[PDB]
Amino acid sequence: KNIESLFDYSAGQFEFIDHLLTMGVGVHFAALIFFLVVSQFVAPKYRIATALSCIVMVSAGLILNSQAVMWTDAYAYVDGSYQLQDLTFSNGYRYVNWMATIPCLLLQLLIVLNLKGKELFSTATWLILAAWGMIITGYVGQLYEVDDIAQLMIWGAVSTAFFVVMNWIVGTKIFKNRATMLGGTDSTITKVFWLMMFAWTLYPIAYLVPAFMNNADGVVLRQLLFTIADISSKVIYGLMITYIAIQQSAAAGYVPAQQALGRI
Ligand SMILES: *C/C=C(C)/C=C/C=C(C)/C=C/C1=C(C)CCCC1(C)C
Ligand SMILES: CCCCCCCC/C=C/CCCCCCCC(=O)O
Ligand SMILES: [Cl-]
Ligand SMILES: [Cl-]
Numbered sequence: 420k421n422i423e424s425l426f427d428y429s430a431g432q433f434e435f436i437d438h439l440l441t442m443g444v445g446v447h448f449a450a451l452i453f454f455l456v457v458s459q460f461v462a463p464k465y466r467i468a469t470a471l472s473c474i475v476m477v478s479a480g481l482i483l484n485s486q487a488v489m490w491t492d493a494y495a496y497v498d499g500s501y502q503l504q505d506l507t508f509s510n511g512y513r514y515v516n517w518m519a520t521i522p523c524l525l526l527q528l529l530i531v532l533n534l535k536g537k538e539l540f541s542t543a544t545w546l547i548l549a550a551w552g553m554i555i556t557g558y559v560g561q562l563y564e565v566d567d568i569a570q571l572m573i574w575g576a577v578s579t580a581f582f583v584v585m586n587w588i589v590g591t592k593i594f595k596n597r598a599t600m601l602g603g604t605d606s607t608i609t610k611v612f613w614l615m616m617f618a619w620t621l622y623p624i625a626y627l628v629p630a631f632m633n634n635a636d637g638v639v640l641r642q643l644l645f646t647i648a649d650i651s652s653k654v655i656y657g658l659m660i661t662y663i664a665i666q667q668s669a670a671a672g673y674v675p676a677q678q679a680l681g682r683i
Contacts, residue, residue, distance in 0.1 A: 422629045422638060427500040430496070436642050437491065443650070448476065460678075460679035461661070462664075462676060465530060465668055469527075469661050471526055472527060479649060479653050482516040514554055525543065525546045532596040546585060559574050571630065572630065586616065602666035611656065621645075621652075622644075
């Protein structure tokens with residue numbers, strides 16, 4: 420049902436996709452160790468924001484690892500090209516993983532925005548419902564990326580509606596709560612918003628690849644877009660969230676944060 424299954428791949432195409440996914444694994448688990456060690460310099464009220472980046476690194480790292488092994492399981496070099504064997508490859512499992520990872524990315528944002536108690540719970544709930552609506556409709560849509568492009572497009576339109584509404588909740592909370600933020604991170608959080616807008620928009624672009632580039636090179640392009648998007652939306656984003664958490668920790672008088680920023 421996925422366009423990947425339609426084509427044979429050159430040695431170059433196959434190996435590049437393998438390297439992309441493997442590099443993805445390496446970057447996420449390397450970042451994991453960074454977030455782990457810096458977590459001790461985060462104040463208790465923000466420390467979960469850094470913990471969530473650790474959780475996202477392993478979740479994303481495992482899905483990329485699984486995709487890479489699925490890639491090599493599914494294809495073998497036969498008569499001059501990599502050809503599909505008995506096992507299958509599908510990006511569908513990425514969608515399932517987003518059900519967990521996207522709420523984690525959203526929650527760590529709400530935490531460094533200094534949302535608390537009732538507002539935190541209600542905002543998270545609405546955000547997660549919007550995100551789940553987006554993911555589920557998108558998942559359904561990509562089931563048709565070979566059989567029914569028109570259906571892919573309509574489910575994609577519905578998903579994009581959830582996407583836009585989710586982004587509106589995010590933007591509204593960011594620009595409303597920007598003023599509460601310490602240590603100059605009122606400035607930084609604005610860049611986080613734009614980073615999110617950029618990186619997350621790469622995913623629906625990948626979703627549409629079967630509509631504008633239905634061939635083996637399109638398959639490569641989609642994996643390339645996922646790689647850019649994953650690293651931007653999880654790793655670079657996580658680094659910014661953690662930087663914001665530490666800076667606010669220091670401004671709030673958390674001594675390990677002050678000491679850590681002092682050594683650099
Ligand atoms: C770490 C993974 C992330 C941040 C994934 C984000 C995914 C999206 C923003 C997906 C968006 C989609 C649309 C807006 C329309 C097409 C269907 C989706 C689900 C790919
Ligand atoms: C935040 C940015 C992260 C960047 C991740 C991407 C790193 C590797 C990028 C690809 C370079 C282009 C390689 C040329 C593709 C050859 C085409 C082919 O052989 O199939
Ligand atoms: Cl605290
Ligand atoms: Cl993920």
